[PDB]
Amino acid sequence: MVAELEEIIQYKKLPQGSERRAMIRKTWNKRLLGCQNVDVWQRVLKVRSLVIKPKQD
Structure with a gap:
């Protein structure tokens, strides 16, 4: 969980506004x-x- 979180952090950090990131992290949260x-x-x-x-979702 921690790891995936870290990678996720890397991702959102890298992520510009709202491209593929929302879906990704969302699904990430779902799974x-x-x-x-x-x-x-x-x-x-x-x-x-x-x-x-909770703003973010």
Whole structure:
């Protein structure tokens, strides 16, 4: 989770505004939710470390 998060960070960092990044990270989050919990919400909060807020979605 941490790793994928890191790579994701690399991605969004690299990402210009809203190209392929939204879909990617979104699906990333979806599949992430696939593994299923509390600490699940913790790493979810790691996605939140990548953020952006409930704004972002």
